[PDB]
């Protein structure tokens, strides 16, 4: 099927310069224009540019071509955005998205980055132990964003709250609950499946 | 560059009801080819966006039947018919008619429920954590509606802001409930010279303090 897959998260140091890439697969790459939105934590959404495999042709706007490259690798059916120049005010989201016909129709997943010079850290994953009982996994100093949280590996979805994180003293902190029935614990194993993407780092944490 | 200026920021809607968003270009977005190429999108928390209606108002395969979009030359429409909580995120239009493209800057749709309690716990700091030398003591306030709610931590009756970090959910797909956590950092030497800790969380249903410890 159609997918456009991105890396969810890269770290890159003020000045330097990063190069994102979007691999499309199920469908015919030169075909389709590939185009790229910035969403910063407040900012709503920004296009960047397209890039048209097909001619070679990239669009951009105006107010970041000096800092922005789009290229395109028919061969791999891969798009790039490089940003140079680096500064805070480029960490966001970035999606890459392709558009022909109707709009964007489908959208990579979104790949955080984030301009520091701070040093990757991977969270430390702490289990939380108390008619209904409501669980927790405290997912504690990392960076940089994003963490993704689990439970039992995607077979069980109904019932969890994932908050955002919360930056402090340069780290972030998040948190998940998941309320479960009292029938469940502990006779059926349940575990906290942590990833953090920057650091490539998974952790499983099963509750008390 | 063409502005997109969309109107409410905010919709609050009940179920079933119908809603309605305007978005307004400060010049024309009819292409050269007399085509208009204005798109309307959804941003549901935790997902990549999500298109509804490309040319004003064709909808994309797969979008409900009770989304349609109407307009032209500047001004434009989205309609939501009986609203349903899997409504819930951020709508915004976008002009793919001239360089650079520009959407609207989004309205968060919301739902409107019953007030709701929220539903209030704590957990003290977990062993393996202590040994480090950190002492986490974490307040879980969820499923309640609307969005404002207060919470006070107190140590042994004192209170205590300073240390404190909040986070809220967006709203819930399922039932249209926010959910809230607080977690008052201290060090693990301090930790251990109090006794009581207090998690305290005043909202809008019960005027009776809601409090766990």
């Known amino acids: 099927e159609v997918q456009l897959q991105q890396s969810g998260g890269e770290l890159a140091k003020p000045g330097a310069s990063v190069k994102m890439s979007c691999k499309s697969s199920g469908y015919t790459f030169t075909a389709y224009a590939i185009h790229w939105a910035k969403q910063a934590a407040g900012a709503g959404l920004e296009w960047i540019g397209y890039?048209?495999?097909?001619?070679?042709?990239?669009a951009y706007n105006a107010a970041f071509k000096g800092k922005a490259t789009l290229a395109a690798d028919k061969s791999s059916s891969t798009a790039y955005m490089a940003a140079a120049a680096l500064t805070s005010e480029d960490s966001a989201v970035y999606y890459c998205?392709?558009?022909?016909?109707?709009?964007?129709?489908?959208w990579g997943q979104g790949t955080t980055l984030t301009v520091s010079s701070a040093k990757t850290t991977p969270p430390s994953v702490y289990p939380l132990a108390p008619s209904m009982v409501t669980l927790g996994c405290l997912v504690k100093g990392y960076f940089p964003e994003p963490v993704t949280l689990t439970w039992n590996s995607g077979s069980l979805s109904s019932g969890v709250h994932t908050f955002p994180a919360v930056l402090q003293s340069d780290l972030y902190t998040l948190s998940s609950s998941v309320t479960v029935t009292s029938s469940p614990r502990p006779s059926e194993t349940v575990t906290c499946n942590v990833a953090h993407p920057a650091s490539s780092t998974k952790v499983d944490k099963k509750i008390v | 560059d063409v502005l997109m200026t969309q109107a409410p920021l905010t919709l609050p809607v009940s179920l079933g009801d119908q809603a309605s968003i305007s978005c307004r270009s400060s010049?024309?977005?009819?292409?050269?080819?007399?085509?208009?190429?204005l798109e309307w999108y959804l941003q549901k928390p935790g997902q990549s966006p999500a298109l509804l209606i490309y040319?004003?108002?064709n909808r994309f395969s797969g979008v409900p039947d009770r989304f349609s979009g109407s307009g032209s030359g500047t001004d434009f429409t989205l309609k939501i018919s009986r609203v349903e909580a899997e409504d819930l995120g951020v709508y915004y239009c976008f002009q793919g008619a001239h360089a650079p493209y520009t959407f609207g800057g989004g309205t968060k749709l919301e739902i409107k429920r019953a007030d709701a309690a929220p539903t209030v716990s704590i957990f003290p700091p977990s062993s393996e954590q202590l040994t480090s030398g950190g002492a986490s003591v974490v307040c879980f306030l969820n499923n309640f509606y609307p969005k404002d709610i207060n919470v006070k931590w107190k140590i042994d009756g004192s209170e205590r802001q300073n240390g404190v970090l909040n986070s809220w959910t967006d709203q819930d797909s399922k039932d249209s409930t926010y959910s809230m956590s607080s977690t008052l950092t201290l060090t693990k030497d301090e930790y251990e010279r109090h006794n009581s800790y207090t998690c305290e969380a005043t909202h809008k249903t019960s005027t009776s303090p809601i409090v766990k410890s």
């Open positions: 998205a392709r558009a022909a016909a109707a709009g964007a129709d489908y």
């Open positions: 040319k004003v108002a």
């Open positions: 890039i048209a495999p097909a001619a070679g042709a990239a």
């Open positions: 010049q024309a977005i009819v292409h050269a080819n007399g085509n208009t190429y």
